[PDB]
Design a protein around this ligand. Structure first.
Ligand code: PS7
Ligand code: MG
Ligand code: MG
Length: 279
């Protein structure tokens, strides 16, 4: 067990801590892609958790890795994570611009004021999650085309939308609402009121409006599953399927705004069995 192995095992532990659905799937990858995913995840985890000066420190670590992949650096932020990311960058082509976009998005979030329209909202989904799909693309496909990026991007954006749809209650408590002003007006919905009084029909309708968008994007990703390498196809499908099942869970908890619903480990294995057998 080397120095490097210790970095990756740390990244892995971050991933298992913060993301039960994605680790479950992505730990099924062959060892070398598995480790690249752990490392990208943990960098994005840390960027997302930044908050100020830690975030600039990370941005600086990333920029050194870009300009000088084969040199030793004295990383300012988290050395275990940065070392692993740099090890990954030596063997794979990484879209640095895509981590800067994510970093910009976390900086802008400081000044978050609700989205006027669905197009600002989809613009944020790109920034938090569409970028992650882009950074992962060369790890999960052997030939990167524009098509491969487009599919990875859309997968990530629709996972963010599913995340939003799950976290409606806890997001309100943290003073955030991600549904667009325009769509809240149209459906006559006020999130404060729902939170206090329970679900109603206007809410379900607005909710299901977005759920249908996420579902349509999901189905469009699945019909293009082929852009990914053969070993990653069933994993990616698992990861997406698990995340989509979050949608059925929300409806069975009656769209509650007072708990985080989840897909249990036993359900995860059942979906894996299903995908597995189709392959
Ligand atoms: C690198 C990796 C797997 C994840 C990166 C974790 C990142 C970027 C955090 C900073 C930005 C944020 C807030 C992202 C939200 C992730 C919710 O996870 P998390 O909050 O940890 O767990 P949960 O909320 O479920 O408990 C999100 C929904 C985007 C997931 C998009 C993916 C996976 C692209 C898939 C495309 C292909 C697989 C081609
Ligand atoms: Mg969330
Ligand atoms: Mg999240």
């Amino acid at each position: 067990m080397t120095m490097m192995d210790m970095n990756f095992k740390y990244c892995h532990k971050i991933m298992k801590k913060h993301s039960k659905s994605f680790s479950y799937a992505f730990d099924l990858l062959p060892e070398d892609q598995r480790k690249a995913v752990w490392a990208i995840y943990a960098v994005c985890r840390k960027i997302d958790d930044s908050i100020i000066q830690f975030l600039n420190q990370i941005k600086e670590d990333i920029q050194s890795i870009e300009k000088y992949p084969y040199e030793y650096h004295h990383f300012q932020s988290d050395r275990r994570i940065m070392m692993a990311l740099q090890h990954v960058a030596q063997h794979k082509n990484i879209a640095f611009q895509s981590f800067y976009n994510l970093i910009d998005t976390v900086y802008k979030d400081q000044h978050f004021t609700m989205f006027e329209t669905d197009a600002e909202l989809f613009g944020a989904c790109y920034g938090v999650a569409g970028t992650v799909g882009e950074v992962l693309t060369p790890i999960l496909s052997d030939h990167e085309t524009h098509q491969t990026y487009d599919v990875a991007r859309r997968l990530g954006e629709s996972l963010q939308l599913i995340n939003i749809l799950r976290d409606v209650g806890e997001d309100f408590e943290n003073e955030r609402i991600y549904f667009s002003k325009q769509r809240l007006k149209q459906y006559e919905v006020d999130i404060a009121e729902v939170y206090q009084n329970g679900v109603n029909n206007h809410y379900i309708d607005l909710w299901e409006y977005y759920a249908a968008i996420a579902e349509k994007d999901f189905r469009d990703v699945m019909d293009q599953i082929k852009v990914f390498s053969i070993e990653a196809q069933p994993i990616i499908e698992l990861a997406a399927r698990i995340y989509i099942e979050i949608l059925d869970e929300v409806r069975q908890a009656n769209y509650t705004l007072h708990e985080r619903v989840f897909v249990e480990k036993r359900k995860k294995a059942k979906l894996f069995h299903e995908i597995n057998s189709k392959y």
